[PDB]
Amino acid sequence: VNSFSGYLKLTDNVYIKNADIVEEAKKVKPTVVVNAANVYLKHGGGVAGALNKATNNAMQVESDDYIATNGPLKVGGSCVLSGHNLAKHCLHVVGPNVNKGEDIQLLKSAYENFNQHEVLLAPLLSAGIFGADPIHSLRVCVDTVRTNVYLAVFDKNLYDKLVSSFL
Numbered sequence: 001v002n003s004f005s006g007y008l009k010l011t012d013n014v015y016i017k018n019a020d021i022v023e024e025a026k027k028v029k030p031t032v033v034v035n036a037a038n039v040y041l042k043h044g045g046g047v048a049g050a051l052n053k054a055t056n057n058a059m060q061v062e063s064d065d066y067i068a069t070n071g072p073l074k075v076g077g078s079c080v081l082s083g084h085n086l087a088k089h090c091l092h093v094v095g096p097n098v099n100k101g102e103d104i105q106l107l108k109s110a111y112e113n114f115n116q117h118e119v120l121l122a123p124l125l126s127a128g129i130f131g132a133d134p135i136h137s138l139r140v141c142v143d144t145v146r147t148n149v150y151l152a153v154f155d156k157n158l159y160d161k162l163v164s165s166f167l
């Protein structure tokens with residue numbers, strides 16, 4: 001049993017909810033929240049900008065030190081950093097950004113990072129300002145992630161479309 005509430009069950013391991021990932025993290029304090037990161041961990045907008053704002057910029061300060069030491073992530077890659085006030089840990093995962101011309105086949109590699117964690121609160125990778133089709137992102141998620149993932153979708157119109165169209 002876990003703390004996650006109000007989710008619709010899509011499969012054995014994937015759950016979905018119309019929820020504000022920031023507000024959900026603040027309520028649950030999950031072991032792992034996933035960030036929709038870029039390779040530079042520049043948390044300007046989208047999910048990343050919202051998560052970072054909720055940490056009062058502490059996520060960005062930590063991230064800048066990580067990049068100064070290790071250099072940029074790979075598209076499809078990840079790193080584990082602090083969850084600050086939102087979670088124990090933040091798994092920063094880089095999905096391909098279609099608005100930069102990145103290979104959508106890298107979305108499966110991105111979701112494979114989730115399998116290193118037994119339970120996660122996450123957004124749909126490469127959705128929103130990363131430009132991918134969220135219906136596709138949900139299909140790759142279901143077909144790739146084997147650990148227990150709780151997906152948060154802020155916009156009701158998209159949430160309702162994801163559920164209604166789910167095979």
Ligand SMILES: Cc1ccc(S(N)(=O)=O)cc1
Nearest residue numbers: 021046047050128154155
């Ligand atoms: C209308 C809206 C949609 C998505 C988000 S976020 N910060 O989860 O990406 C916020 C507001």
